[PDB]
Amino acid sequence: SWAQSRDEQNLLQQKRIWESPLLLAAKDNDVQALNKLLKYEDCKVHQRGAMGETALHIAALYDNLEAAMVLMEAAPELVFEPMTSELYEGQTALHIAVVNQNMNLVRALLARRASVSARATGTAFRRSPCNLIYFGEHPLSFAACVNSEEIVRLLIEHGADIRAQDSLGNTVLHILILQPNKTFACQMYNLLLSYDRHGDHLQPLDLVPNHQGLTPFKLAGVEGNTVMFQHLMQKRKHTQWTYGPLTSTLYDLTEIDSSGDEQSLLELIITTKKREARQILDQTPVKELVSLKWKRYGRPYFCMLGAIYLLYIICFTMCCIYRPLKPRTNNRTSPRDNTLLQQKLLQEAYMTPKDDIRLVGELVTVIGAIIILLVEVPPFHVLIITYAFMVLVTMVMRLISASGEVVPMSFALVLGWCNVMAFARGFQMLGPFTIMIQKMIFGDLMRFCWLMAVVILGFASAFYIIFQTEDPEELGHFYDYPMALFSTFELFLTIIDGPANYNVDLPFMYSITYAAFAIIATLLMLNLLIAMMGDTHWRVAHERDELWRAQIVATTVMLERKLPRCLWPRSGICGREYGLGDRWFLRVEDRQD
Amino acid sequence: SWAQSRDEQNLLQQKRIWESPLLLAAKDNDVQALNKLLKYEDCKVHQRGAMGETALHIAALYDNLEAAMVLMEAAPELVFEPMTSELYEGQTALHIAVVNQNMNLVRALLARRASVSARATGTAFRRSPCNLIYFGEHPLSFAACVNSEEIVRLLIEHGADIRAQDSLGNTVLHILILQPNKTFACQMYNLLLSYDRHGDHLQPLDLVPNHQGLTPFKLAGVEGNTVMFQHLMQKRKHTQWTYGPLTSTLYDLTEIDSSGDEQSLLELIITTKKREARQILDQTPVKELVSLKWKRYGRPYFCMLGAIYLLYIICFTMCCIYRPLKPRTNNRTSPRDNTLLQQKLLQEAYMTPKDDIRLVGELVTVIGAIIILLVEVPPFHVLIITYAFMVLVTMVMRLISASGEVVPMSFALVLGWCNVMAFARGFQMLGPFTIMIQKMIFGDLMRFCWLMAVVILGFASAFYIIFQTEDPEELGHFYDYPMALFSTFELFLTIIDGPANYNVDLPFMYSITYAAFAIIATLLMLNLLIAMMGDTHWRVAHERDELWRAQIVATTVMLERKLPRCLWPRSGICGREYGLGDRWFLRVEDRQD
């Protein structure tokens, strides 16, 4: 809707230039038409367009070098003119001549003393999926993005401050990484770091964060610009001796796995929604860390948590398959050939001190339940926190001592068991299968359960109307509509045997309909779900160890934020005694090929 | 952990050179800084690093030719200096100058009379997956591996003994095969066999075993260096007449299928854990043998064993489906609507001489059981040896004459039957299906049963808590927890019909949970196993006849070690009468294309 308002504003600008004789003469450089229009008669030069145009902006935008030469004699001060409002705010013609790769008015605007500190604070320049581009505010940032090297160099030779920022806090190095051209923009990164002359006594342009606190090295990791990222590692690495085909290189390891303000590089690789930024994990200075971090101190510290969780659920259940549950001494003959039960769940009979051992084993879960919430005072926490509710619920179900106690118990038990699926990630060749289950359910099945619920609410609603006629004493598959859904559900998954009596005849509309149910659902709708399962399985295993590797890291940093020090040293060997400084290093070796 | 100790030692060497002014001057060839440091003042030259450095080692290692020229005037005897300890033991600068492909100090070290017999016995040179390289001890072996031909030739012209060995017994030909460059290293194999001048009266360098007894021809087969292997067959073959497009070539067949110390080449191709070394079996002098060895004398000798095994198991079942087993005259009414039985297994009633024919047929298995153990006094022996236990167990179950006799009987029978799966390998287009079953179970299923046991110990543990309430007289799927696992197990494999009564109402938490069991397991967890089956099936049949060919050979040599001679001639025709010698040959023909 706003883009239409961008388009409604845009054509109004075209109708505006169509009516003004100056700006329509500013479309094409008809200089003989201009000098009759400009030099002879007295025309105002502040003819504003639909959003703040001048003729000086138009000839700069439609590549009229020669027409703007006439404009410089007539307009000495329209260089000092920003574009006005609502898409272009603070844009001048110094920006515009840069965007069209040159004009040599570029040289003439500075010969008329243009302002290179002009900030393009418009909406149509701000970072958005609405704009198809993003180049910041300053024309120096407009210079570096379009890959025009000498045009950049001219701005250095007129005082364009490299250390400028946008509203987002992004400097000119941050804009170069955000461009979709990756190799084509990498050469500017070397040229613009040739002009980092002083550094302003701290962070010499390569460590300056934005408003959200992002160095361009880490932001390169966030966007996953892999080609740029290898080029920034060339600066970071500091090679030691080389031994023929061997190279004892030494990566720097400074912003990777800190405990800083954003706590890592690695979590920022995880917590973005950009799927493609996880390609960095195959790159060797990061790939070596997460293998070393997981091999020693990662994997056995995980399984030591994993061994505790198995003994927890076995204990639970041991205190959940043994339940008090007297024989039925209460109200007897309420099930008149009807809802059967005889246990009724003992009130406070906590005698027989085998039950005191059970009372010990019950308290093992309860104390362990509080620990999980003492962890989680702030896709698998949603298992274990909902595990932590139901253990607390089933004790409140015992302190109040109500009746409906199995209904939180069954949520508690199977999610307690199915949460050790999460522990199968640290047992390699079992990792991404848990990723596969998440890919089936929230990726394919929940956008397919809307298809199965259509069919199943037809036939179950159908069969209730067919078997409204019959005595459900024979053929009790559809005695009522609530279980009719459940009864059709496993005919749909080929479990219930198919309702057939053979003592009496069936009604005639049943035989057609349940046969039509068989064709449309038993072989067809079921197997088309299986091919969706069979499609995504081949999608995962073709990228297997990748999503295994992404599983390890996000597990690892999550383990670090909830485990203290003095049991975990920060990986990579230290400095200051081997004599480089507080930067902590790790080395890696390679053959040439 | 040791690699960190390699890295902790490595940076300490960097801090060591950082503090010493001589070695830091030995980093870059600042000769004007050196002559003030060396020629003017008196500096010791035995400045040892963190593991035994000299400045003579450093300039040799960081490619300072000119700095080492100053070192030769100052240090006449540091050429005679090995690297000291714990990674580099016995390494001198004569080794180091070789590794950097030249220095012409290479010529000058021998001009200072360097020792080419120096043995690099360090840990960081020994064969390991910790080291990324392996080049032995002697610098002649360091010369040939880096593919520097004239630098090799210089060592011949100063007395480098080619016949030297490492601690492993590997000569210089063994190192050339172990390099990952295959074509790039093959040219050294011709050049170094140009200098096998005498041969030391026996094994002229091409038949010298190591400490584990490996000729380089056979070791080429063990590592599967296929490109090198074809080049070694060029030496072995001895071509006869050629007839236009025909070529009556004649491969040598000496170390392939011996009865020597390592009993073959072929078993060594099998019993390595290297999967890729079985690529040799497609190469034509070996591919022709195993086809000829299996076509005649391989296949019908296998099926003659296979015909015996079928009549064995048929005579096994014949004395196992007829069992003595009286009617129940003993304790009657112990199953109070409970565990039923009426046979109780007769003690010693061996009358009715039809049973004596059974007593004959029982002794057929027992004698045949001892033969299998008389074979196996020292993945399918584990079938037949466990077959051999249970037949012995079921006779000890008869001599003691105990009761629990069917429990070893059922292990005995189905593994007796399923061991003739192994006999389907010699019946082409049935071979690799038995390989597929091993690929499913130990390759995919046992790294997936840990996933199924998670789900199945939830829901079976769940349903026991749901159906703790109910009378199990109706709906006896879950009367107890031990059979509750078995009852959920075939709901998981879509066998048991789904527990549904329709006389009474079911408990409410059942209907949700068993429906949730249906979604997560019946279509989802089951079919994702099937796609794993459907993945590896396409992996096997794409490489079908390969793993069929590997199946034949490992079957064949296993048949040779347990069958004597005078029924098996060693294949390939003989010599000494056709006039070449004791080497036994086989010929093969080919069109040009």
Numbering used by the authors:
A (entry chain B), B (entry chain C): 28 to 405, 424 to 638
Task: Show passages lifted from the paper.
We thus turned to human TRPV6 (hTRPV6), of which we recently resolved the open-state structure by cryo-electron microscopy (cryo-EM). In order to increase the affinity of hTRPV6 to 2-APB, we introduced the Y467A mutation, homologous to Y466A in TRPV6*. As expected, hTRPV6-Y467A showed 4.5-fold increased potency of 2-APB inhibition (IC50 = 60 ± 13 μM, n = 3) compared to hTRPV6. We determined the cryo-EM structure of apo hTRPV6-Y467A, which is in the open-state conformation, and it is nearly identical (RMSD = 0.765) to the cryo-EM structure of wild-type hTRPV6. Lipids are observed in positions similar to those seen in hTRPV641; lipid 1 is bound in a pocket formed by the intracellular half of the S1–S4 domains and C-terminal part of TRP helix, while lipid 2 is above the S4–S5 linker and contacts both S3 and S4 of the same subunit, and S5–S6 of the neighboring subunit. In both hTRPV641 and hTRPV6-Y467A, the activating lipid head penetrates this area to interact with Q483 and R470.
